[PDB]
Amino acid sequence: MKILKTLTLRGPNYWSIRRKKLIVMRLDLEDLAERPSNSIPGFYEGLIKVLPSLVEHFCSPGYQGGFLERVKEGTYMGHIVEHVALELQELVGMTAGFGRTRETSTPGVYNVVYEYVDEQAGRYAGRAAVRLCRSLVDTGDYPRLELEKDLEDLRDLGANSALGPSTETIVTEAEARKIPWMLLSARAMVQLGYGVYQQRIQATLSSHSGILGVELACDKEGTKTILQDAGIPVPRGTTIQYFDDLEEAINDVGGYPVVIKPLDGNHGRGITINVRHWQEAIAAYDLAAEESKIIVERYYEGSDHRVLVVNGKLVAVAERIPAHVTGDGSSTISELIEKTNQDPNRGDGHDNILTKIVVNKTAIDVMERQGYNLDSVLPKDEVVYLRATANLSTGGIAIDRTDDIHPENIWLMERVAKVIGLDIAGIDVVTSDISKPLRETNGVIVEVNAAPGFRMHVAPSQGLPRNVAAPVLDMLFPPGTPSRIPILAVTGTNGKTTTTRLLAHIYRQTGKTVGYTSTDAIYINEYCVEKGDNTGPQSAGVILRDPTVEVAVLETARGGILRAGLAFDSCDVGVVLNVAADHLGLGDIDTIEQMAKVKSVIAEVVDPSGYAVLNADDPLVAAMADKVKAKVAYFSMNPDNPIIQAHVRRNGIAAVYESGYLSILEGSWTLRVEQAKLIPMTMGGMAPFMIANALAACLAAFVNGLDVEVIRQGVRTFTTSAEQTPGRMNLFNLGQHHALVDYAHNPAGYRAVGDFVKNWQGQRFGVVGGPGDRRDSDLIELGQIAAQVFDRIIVKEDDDKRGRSEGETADLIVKGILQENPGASYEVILDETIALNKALDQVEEKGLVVVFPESVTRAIDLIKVRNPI
């Protein structure tokens, strides 16, 4: 079994709208395609003993005995590696359950599709499933050590990509509120929202956190000075530049119960909490002295409380207590530690509520100061601390006290956050009773913290958990405001680029910044950002991440959808223009019914409050209306189309071409926008395919709320001139002669241009172009089309590229054109550059010549030799 190709999908796609995270593996069963399980001796017992957990899988029968039964039956291996890749991820805690298989290409090649949680772990599990299954169809088993090492690699891959818990907390609430989110390429930042409404976060810091507030909060001496000048209670204390001056400093504080800290930070290290004697002060000094250069603060009694303030308003309060044991019967300290460290709520870290208590030299040091050691028996209800400070990560506890805080203390905490200048802040308070004013209990404010963590508030050991994230998202995205900008997505086999540029032009008349992507470039308000084929999810992301964009208009191609899914999840308007047989055989899409499922992805992601715009003159497109959860609007070139009539009778909206006008039917009323003859993109009203694109753009603008007058202004001033849209209807006036340069690909474009030619109000109709060798066997069809339109048909297909042989393509065109109508001066010339398109005076005055060149760049350089007007 070989893997030929792997795709990673990230967004709504062909296989599923909801299952956004999928891996598609193209698997070649070189062997096994001819051996349906029962032809592989031992491949049942080996599979169940290596992976005994492959039991719950229902596969297709629908019950718990569903899979495995299918292994006893003649199931092929490409359907089995799919249940192994899912199981290998489940065995390491990553839950995934979706999967499918399809046969493609020649017999034996399959598409294996499965769900992933982590992108690298997903691809890893796929490769591993193939190795496991291949060994078992060769030998009868798989070494245990070759299974355990793979499970170890999956566990590491899924750990390395994890978001920290403070970001998980914000992201989860954002999803509940339907706010889109993305990871950014730098500094572990996350973006929330689109375009002009975007916000950024990094853990517990945000786009609203100022630098001056954050730096002041990290300066302990600066913070103390600012707060005491505001009348806020802080500890009494001084500083020494590592001189042996403690004997004097203690005198300013007022006595020996003092606190000695390192003069700078290095985590919670080097701190002595309650000094009572000179010799203790000396020991405390030598330890504090290890760091860079308050040392003697007065010691205050009370508990350690953490207060969380988010936007100048109190959110949560928690009381923190250090790891300890108590006189829970007449047991020793070592016995008590083992007794409580068995509690089911303790273990590891962020895995459970509490962690384990660890005895180390620092636990011994803390106990010695209390008069105890491990072999001592405690008196009933005596409490012994094993740590100097509280922390959940070291085995302490946290108690919710949010509803017990006095109204005056609430006022003071909010004032502290505003004085320093922080949006999200943690405040460290020492007090004996949080339910009484700090001035009565003689409490103090010890510290202010920028970017505080949330674990003690969202997962307390006692009391009720609090939703901390909700107040954060409320300041970033205040109630009543949007987090998204309008998205207009355009798809279909032909006409996307033209429709996209017109629609962007119309929105631009409102004065907003409009960004759009097409197959030519990425633009913002008429400035080019990038050039080249910019369709696909990577370009859509440039516009959506751009801080200036107010409206996004995106042309969407099948290549991008099949390769990586859609970039945006949902949109306001989804436009489907047509389904036609181009690009068949590529991407495993062989039929027209399948191509219709690819295009329908846009219609199915339109938000229920939005609209789908469908072509009522197209049988595959109109049919999509029964899949759409959104409202449906229709357009047509025929006012009598039964769909349109049935729809407006139920008070729907439609756009039709009638009486020379482009108009909107809204219920019983008709709104005329303009005449086809007065809209420049339509060639004097003689190009039906241009009219149809204008109708789709006008209807999309209308259903999304633009006024009719704005729409009229936009269609009247929109141009598709030469050197703006090369290769797309470039008509040149060259003496008493006209010639058109275009670039049809599939046959629908040869017909669309042919209709323009039929309507030419002049003399002879000539054609001077044709298909290259990259086409399927449709040369006769293309020849038949030319024969129905032109009276000067000259065959050219023996070009400079010559993808296949020489002039055979031209001969096949000749067979087609003479089959349909052997009456158009059917010369074969082959030289498309200095003959076919040079002897144009063979055409009667004011006739029309249509060029379908291999390259429009050359065609528009050559047409110019006649001095166009």
Partner: peptide
């Protein structure tokens, strides 16, 4: 240096 980011969950204080």
């Amino acid at each position: 240096d980011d969950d204080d």
